[PDB]
Amino acid sequence: SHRKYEAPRHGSLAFLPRKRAARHRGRVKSFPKDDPKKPVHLTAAMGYKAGMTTIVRDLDRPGAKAHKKEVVEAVTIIDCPPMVVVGLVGYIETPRG
Amino acid sequence: IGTRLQEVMARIHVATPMDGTTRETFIPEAVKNLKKYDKNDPNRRVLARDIEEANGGAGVFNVDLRKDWILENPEWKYDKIPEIFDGKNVYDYIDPDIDAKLQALEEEEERLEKEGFYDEDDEEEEEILQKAEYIREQHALIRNEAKMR
Amino acid sequence: RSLFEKPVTIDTIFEKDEMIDVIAVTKGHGFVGVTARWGTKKLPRKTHKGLRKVACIGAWHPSHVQWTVARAGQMGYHHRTSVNHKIYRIGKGDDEANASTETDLTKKKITPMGGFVRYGEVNNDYVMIKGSVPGVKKRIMTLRKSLFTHTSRKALEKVELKWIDTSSEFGHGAFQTAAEKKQFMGTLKKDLQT
Amino acid sequence: MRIENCFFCGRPAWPSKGITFMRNDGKAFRFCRSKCHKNFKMKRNPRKLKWTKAYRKNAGKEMVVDSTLQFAARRNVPVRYNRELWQKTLKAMERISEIRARRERVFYKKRMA
Amino acid sequence: GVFAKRTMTKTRRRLRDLDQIERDLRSPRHLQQYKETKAAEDLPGLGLYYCIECAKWFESETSLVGHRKGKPHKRRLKQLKEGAYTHEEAMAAIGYRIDNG
Amino acid sequence: AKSARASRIKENHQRFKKNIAGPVEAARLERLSAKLMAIAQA
Amino acid sequence: MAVRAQFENSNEVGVFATLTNSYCLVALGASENFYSVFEAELQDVIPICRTTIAGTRIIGRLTAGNRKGLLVPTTTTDQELQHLRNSLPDDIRIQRIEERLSALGNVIVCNDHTALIHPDLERETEEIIADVLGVEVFRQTIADHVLVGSYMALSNQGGLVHPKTSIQDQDELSSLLGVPLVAGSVNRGSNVIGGGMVVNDWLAVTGLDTTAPELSVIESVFRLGEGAGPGAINTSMKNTIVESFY
Amino acid sequence: KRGAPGGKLKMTLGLPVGAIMNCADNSGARNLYIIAVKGAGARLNRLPAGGVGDMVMATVKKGKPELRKKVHPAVIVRQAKPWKRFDGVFLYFEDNAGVIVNPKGEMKGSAITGPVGKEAAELWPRIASNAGVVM
Ligand SMILES: [Zn+2]
Ligand SMILES: [Zn+2]
C-alpha cells in the first residue's frame, strides 16, 4: 500500500556511483564553447589549495539589506605558481567524437 | 458628561502656555523663495528618483554616499580613509590638536634622553654563578641516581 | 608554439571579480554507514541489529535490492565540479603587502602567523576565492572559465576588501603580526635574558 | 571597521573573533575567545586570574602612567575628514608606538633590577 | 552542594551578576526594576525576606538571619568589598579612555 | 514559481547575457588576451 | 505643508526619518522614493543625509537632535559617525553618547528650546543633552508613557501628543514647553505620534494612512500653510473633529 | 497577509515548538508557550522553530486569566541560542522573550521591558517605537 507521509528521497541520484574518483587530479569534462571572433585565450589553470581565512568586504549590492555595509566572509586561498607551457595537442571531429 | 464625550472634549481642547509667550521659530529665508514642486512642470527640479530611473531603476542604481560631503578640499571627497594601521585604530588617534601633543612628547623624549632615562649599564660573580650552576647539576645527577635505585 | 617553454602566470588567465569554476577531488572519508553517507534517520535506541541503518531496504517487488536504496560504502574522494566562485583578489608573490588593503595599511603577506596549518607559507601568486572549494589542503585545484555568460549581478559586482585576517589558525589567534603580538605582550623574561 | 578589546582578558578582538553576551540591563560583553567566555559564565574574576590584563594592571606589572598612553581614546565627537590630518596621524602613530616600546622596556628593567 | 551541577553553566540557569548586585546596593531604583521583573506571589516568603548581596529570596526572617551566618554570604561580602569587575576597569586595564570633548 | 527551465526565464536570461554581462566579459577577455599575447611575443 | 509619505509601504515615517530645522536624516533604502519626498519638500534648503545607525535602518528612533546638535547612541560605528560629520556643516555639533537607554529617538524629544526625556536617563546624559542641544531638560511622561520621543511630535510652533492625554496634563506640559499642545492621532487612529510622523517649523511628513481630519489637526497645531493656527481646532474644525473622533 | 516578514536574513533558530519564553511587554501575560511558527516549511518529523524577529503563535501559561483562553500572535525579541549577524558577530541574550502583537504587527501592550534585538526592531516598526534599548 501507499506511503502514508510523503518525504523526498535521501541524496541525489545525479552523483552516482559514490565511488572513489578514478584519478587524483580533477578532470575538466567540458571546456567553454569556442568562438573564433574572440581573441585567443587559455581556458583553465592549476593551483594548490593552501587554506582558508576571513575578510571584511565593503558591500555594494543595491537592493540587499547589507548594502553599503561591512560583511564578514570566508575565503579560500589557492597558491598559484606560474605554469610552464610544454606542448600542443590537436583534435579533429569524427562521427565517433 | 460620558466617557466618550469627555474623550472628544480632550481631543478638541487646545492647551496654551499660561504666560502667553511664544517660542521663537527658526525658518530659513529660502523657504519663502522656494517654488513648489509639480510633477507636470517641464522645468521641475530633477529628483534622486528621476536619476535612479534614468540609471537602471531601483535595485540596480548605486547611490553615491560621498556626493554631498562638505570637506575643506573637494578633491578629498573620494579618498580611501585609513582605519587600521599596525594593529591600532586610526580613529582612536584622530585628534585636531595632534601636533602640539606630539611636540610635547618629543620635548619630553629629548629631556629624558638628556637626563639619562634610557641609559644601560664582575668576573668573581660570574665565576661563583658558574660554580653554583655546576653544584646544581651535581645535585640533579645525585637525585637521578636515587630515583633510579 | 609561441608559448612553448614559457611561464604563464595566473593573472594572465583570470582576473579579479571574475566568477570561475573549481574542479577537484573531495575529502576522503573511507567506508561510511548510511546515516552519514546518505543522511538517513537513526532508528530508536537499542534497536536490534543496530540503529545506524535503514530498517527496510526492500518491502516490495522486485525480489531484489534496488539501486536507489541507501547502502554503506565509500564516502568522499569524489570528483566534483563546483561553479560560480567569485575571485576576490589575485595577489602577487613578489608583493610584500599582498594582504594589505586601502583602509588597512599594515604591510603583511597572506600567510597567517605560524603558517598555514599543514601547508606552509604562500610565497607565490595566490587566488582568493569567496566561499569554499571541493578539495583539501595541499590538493591540486583546476580553475576553469565559466561555460556560459553569467546571469547574476554578483558576477558583475566589483569587490572592495577592507581587511584580510592573518592571525594564527593554529588556535585562537588575536594578533595579525608578530610585531603586534610583541607590542601587546610587552617585554618577556627571555628578552632581558638575551 | 575597528579593533575591539576583550572584556575579560583585554586581548585585541578582531572581526568574527569571539562572542558577545547581551545582558537584559542593556550592557554588551565582547569576548575574544571561548576561554574568556566560559570563565565569565563560571563567574571567575579577571582581576584574580593572573593571565589577564586586569590582573596585570591591578598588580602593577603594566606601564599605565605614561604620556604615550594618552593618544588613544574613544572619540565621541567626530572630526571632519582631512587628508593631511590623517597622514600626520599615521606618522604620529608610528612614532608613539616606538616611544612606547622604549619606555615599556625601561619599565620592565626597573621591575627586574 | 550545587543542585544539578551538570547544567550549572546553561544560560537558563544563570544567576545575577556581581556588578548588577553592586548597582542594586548603590541605587534602590535598579533593585526595584529587578524586583518588578519578578512575581511576588511565586517568590519564597512572598518576597518579604531578600538578601541583596546574594540576590536571594528566603522563606522566613529566621532563614535569612541564619543564611547571614554562612560562608556563601561572607564570600559575597568579601567579593563586594574587593569590588566588581566592570567595563571601566576593563578600559583602565588596557589604558583606554573615553573622550567626550 | 517559474522553473529554472521555464521559457520566459530562459528568454530573460538571454536578454541579460546579450545586453549586460556580455560587454563586461568581452572587455575582460580583451585585457586578459592582451596580457597573454604580451607574454607570448616576449 | 503636511505631506503624506511611505517608507517601503510603511506608514511609520518617524521610525525612518529625523527632521530638524537645520538638517534631515533618512534611512538608506532599496530605492530613492523616500529620499525624493523630502528632497521635493526641501529643495536644498537644509541638507538631507542617507544614514545608517548600528547597521540598522531605524534611524528616527535611534537618533535625537534639533537645529543645534545631533546625538547618536553608543553602538554607532566610526564610519557612520564620519559620514554624518562629513555630511553636516560645522554649525551642528554631533556627539555619540554612552546612554544605557540607547533608543535616543524614543527617550528624547526636543525642539530648539527645550527637551523632554525618559525619567531614568543618566545625569551625565542629561548634562550632555543640555550642552550639545543647547536646551533646558525636564523629566516627563505623556499618559504614563516614558518613551516621550515616540509618543509626542514637537516643534517650535507647537506639539501633538498622545490622544489619551488628560486636559490637565496637556495644560501642565504646555506651561512647561511654552508651545500650544493638542492631543490627536496619526495613521488612522494610532497613538504612536513620534513613530508616525516628523515635523519641523515649516514641514510635517506623516504616513499615508493619516486621515484628512487628523491631518488638518496637525496643520493647525504646527502652523503649516497660510492661515494655520491652533484656534481652528476649537473654533473652525470643532464639528469635523467631534464627528470624526466620537 | 500572513505574518512571516520579508527581507530577513538567515539566522540560527533557537526556539522550537513547545518552548516557554518570557513575556517582555505589559499586556498582563508573564510567559508565552509556542505552539506554531509563521512561515515554517514542511519536513518529516522536524519541529517548527523560530528566532529573533519571527512571528509565532503562543498561548499564555502564566498571567491574567483573560489572556489564558486565546492563541495570540507574538514576535520573538530575545533568544539565548547564539547566532551570527552579517558583520560577523556571534551574539546571544540571557533569556528568550517575545511580545504579543496583532497580525498587522502592532503591539498589544504599551511598553517593552528590557532590550530587543536588531532583527525584531528592523522588521517590526511598532516594536522599534516601543523599544527602550536596541542591541
Ligand atoms: Zn579574551
Ligand atoms: Zn546573603
Give me the DSSP letters along D25-87: TS-EEEESSHHHHHHHHTT--TTTSTTSHHHHHHHT-S--S-GGGGS--EE-S-----HHHHH
Q: How far is the CA of E42 from the centre of ligand 2 (A)?
A: 20
Question: What is the rounded distance in angstroms from the CA atom of residue C90 to the CA atom of residue C94?
Answer: 12
Helix axes D83-111, B98-115, angle to 10 degrees: 30
Closest of H95, H105, H120, H126 to residue H30, by C-alpha: H95
Measured in whole angstroms, the distance separating CA G131 from the mean position of its chain's CA atoms is 20
Amino acid letter, residue B131: K
> Where does residue H70 rank: exposed (0-12), middle (13-18), buried (19+ CB within 10 A)?
exposed
Cβ atoms < 10 Å from Cβ of G211: 17
Residue C169 counted as an annotated binding residue: yes
Give CB contacts under 8 A, 24+ apart, made by H3-7.
H3/H38, H3/H39, H3/H55, H3/H73, H3/H103, H3/H105, H4/H38, H4/H39, H4/H54, H4/H55, H5/H53, H5/H55, H5/H123, H5/H124, H7/A65, H7/H123
Question: What is the rounded distance in angstroms from the CA atom of residue D2 to the CA atom of residue E96?
Answer: 14
Q: How far is the CA of E81 from the centre of ligand 1 (A)?
A: 25
Longest dimension (CA), chain E: 53
Question: What is the rounded distance in angstroms from the CA atom of residue E66 to the CA atom of residue G130?
Answer: 50
Q: Which of D10, D38, D42 sits opposite E94 (nearest CB)?
A: D10
Rounded to 5°, the CA angle C28-C32-C36 comes to 100
Nearest-Cα residue of chain E relative to residue H63: E39
| Chain-chain contact of H134 with G107 (C-beta, under 8 angstroms) | no
On whether the CB atoms of residues G5 and G189 are closer than 8 A, the answer is no
- Give, in order, the Cα–Cα distances in Å from G5 to each of C192, E99, G10, G19: 70, 39, 9, 14
Longest dimension (CA), chain A: 64
Instruction: Report chain C's C-alpha Rg in angstroms.
Output: 24
> Where does residue G235 rank: exposed (0-12), middle (13-18), buried (19+ CB within 10 A)?
exposed
Question: What is the rounded distance in angstroms from the CA atom of residue G21 to the CA atom of residue G202?
Answer: 8
Question: What is the rounded distance in angstroms from the CA atom of residue C135 to the CA atom of residue C26?
Answer: 5
Q: How far D7 CA sits from the closest chain E CA (Å)? A: 6
- Identify the H or E element spanning B85: strand B84-85
Rounded to 5°, the CA angle C173-C179-C182 comes to 75
**Cell numbers at residue G234, please?**
476649537
Helix (H, G, I), strand (E, B) or coil at E81: helix
Cβ atoms < 10 Å from Cβ of G94: 20
Q: Could you please report the per-residue DSSP string of H52-99?
A: TT-EEEEE-SSB-GGGTTSEEEEEEEE-SS-EE-TTS-EEEESS-EEE
G35-47: buried (b, 16+ CB within 10 Å) or exposed (e) per residue? Answer: bbbbbbbbeebbb
Helix (H, G, I), strand (E, B) or coil at G244: helix
Closest of C29, C55, C58 to residue C43, by C-alpha: C55
On whether the CB atoms of residues G131 and G176 are closer than 8 A, the answer is no
Helix (H, G, I), strand (E, B) or coil at A44: strand
Sheet holding G108-110, edge to edge: G108-110, G114-117, G136-139
| Chain-chain contact of E97 with D73 (C-beta, under 8 angstroms) | yes
Question: What is the rounded distance in angstroms from the CA atom of residue A85 to the CA atom of residue A90?
Answer: 15
Rounded to 5°, the CA angle C189-D10-D69 comes to 80
| Chain-chain contact of E100 with D77 (C-beta, under 8 angstroms) | yes
> Where does residue D81 rank: exposed (0-12), middle (13-18), buried (19+ CB within 10 A)?
buried
| The residue to which cell 483562553 is assigned | H69
Helix (H, G, I), strand (E, B) or coil at E97: coil
Residues 6 or more apart in contact with residue C53 via CB below 8 angstroms: C33, C34, C35, C43, C47
Question: What is the rounded distance in angstroms from the CA atom of residue A15 to the CA atom of residue E17?
Answer: 54
On whether the CB atoms of residues G198 and G19 are closer than 8 A, the answer is yes
**Cell numbers at residue G43, please?**
529643495
Question: What is the rounded distance in angstroms from the CA atom of residue A73 to the CA atom of residue D15?
Answer: 10
Closest of G198, G140, G146, G134 to residue G174, by C-alpha: G140
**Cell numbers at residue G118, please?**
525618559
- Strand pairing category for C19-25 and B14-15: unpaired
Q: State whether residue E9 sits within 8 Å of chain D by CB.
A: yes
On whether the CB atoms of residues E89 and D7 are closer than 8 A, the answer is no
| Chain-chain contact of G195 with H128 (C-beta, under 8 angstroms) | yes
Nearest-Cα residue of chain D relative to residue H114: D24
Q: Report the number of secondary-structure helices (H) and strands (E) in chain F.
A: 2, 0
> Where does residue F24 rank: exposed (0-12), middle (13-18), buried (19+ CB within 10 A)?
middle
End-to-end alpha-carbon separation of chain D, Å? Answer: 42
Helix (H, G, I), strand (E, B) or coil at G154: strand
Q: Which of G57, G147, G194 sits opposite H132 (nearest CB)?
A: G147
Torsion of CA D5, D8, D11, D15, to 10 degrees: -50
On whether the CB atoms of residues A31 and A47 are closer than 8 A, the answer is no
Q: Which spans in chain G are helix H?
A: 13-16, 33-41, 59-62, 78-87, 104-107, 123-133, 148-151, 167-177, 193-196, 212-222, 231-234, 238-245
| The residue to which cell 593631511 is assigned | D84
On whether the CB atoms of residues B73 and D83 are closer than 8 A, the answer is yes
Beta strands in C27-78 (DSSP E): 28-32, 73-76
Q: State whether residue D43 sits within 8 Å of chain H by CB.
A: no
Question: What is the rounded distance in angstroms from the CA atom of residue G180 to the CA atom of residue G184?
Answer: 13
Q: How many CA atoms lie within 13 A of E46 on its CB side?
A: 0
Amino acid letter, residue E30: H
Residues in chain A: 97
Residues in chain E: 101
Residues 6 or more apart in contact with residue C117 via CB below 8 angstroms: A51, C137, C169, C170
Question: What is the rounded distance in angstroms from the CA atom of residue E92 to the CA atom of residue E86?
Answer: 10
- Strand pairing category for C161-164 and A44-58: antiparallel
| Chain-chain contact of E100 with G128 (C-beta, under 8 angstroms) | yes
| Chain-chain contact of A63 with G55 (C-beta, under 8 angstroms) | no
Resolution in A: 2.2
| Chain-chain contact of D1 with A54 (C-beta, under 8 angstroms) | no
Question: What is the rounded distance in angstroms from the CA atom of residue D41 to the CA atom of residue C116?
Answer: 32
**Cell numbers at residue H50, please?**
523560530
Q: Report the number of secondary-structure helices (H) and strands (E) in chain G.
A: 12, 15
DSSP G201: S
Q: What backbone phi and psi angles, to 5 degrees, belong to G26? A: -125, 150
Helix (H, G, I), strand (E, B) or coil at C145: coil
Rounded to 5°, the CA angle H118-H122-H125 comes to 125
Judging contacts by C-beta atoms under 8 Å, the chain H residues touching residue D23 are: 93-94
> Please, which residues bridge with residue A71 across strands?
A57
Annotated binding site of H for Mg(2+): 41, 45
> Please, which residues bridge with residue G2 across strands?
G204
> Where does residue D63 rank: exposed (0-12), middle (13-18), buried (19+ CB within 10 A)?
buried
Question: What is the rounded distance in angstroms from the CA atom of residue G70 to the CA atom of residue G20?
Answer: 10
Question: Residue E83, by phi and psi: left (phi above 0), alpha (psi -120 to 50) or beta?
Answer: left
Q: How far D76 CA sits from the closest chain E CA (Å)? A: 5
On whether the CB atoms of residues C99 and A75 are closer than 8 A, the answer is no
> Please, which residues bridge with residue A53 across strands?
A75
- Strand pairing category for B88-89 and D12-13: unpaired
- Identify the H or E element spanning G160: strand G159-161
Question: What is the rounded distance in angstroms from the CA atom of residue G126 to the CA atom of residue G119?
Answer: 10
Question: What is the rounded distance in angstroms from the CA atom of residue E89 to the CA atom of residue E95?
Answer: 9
- Identify the H or E element spanning G137: strand G136-139
Which ligand has the nearest atom to the CA of D54?
1
Please identify among residues 75-94 of chain C the ones whose CB lies closer than 8 Å to any CB of chain B. none
Helix axes E61-68, E71-82, angle to 10 degrees: 60
Q: Could you please report the per-residue DSSP string of B121-142?
A: --HHHHHHHHHHHHHHHHHHHH
- Identify the H or E element spanning F15: helix F7-16
Q: How far D38 CA sits from the closest chain A CA (Å)? A: 24
Q: How far is the CA of E9 from the centre of ligand 2 (A)?
A: 21
Helix (H, G, I), strand (E, B) or coil at E62: helix
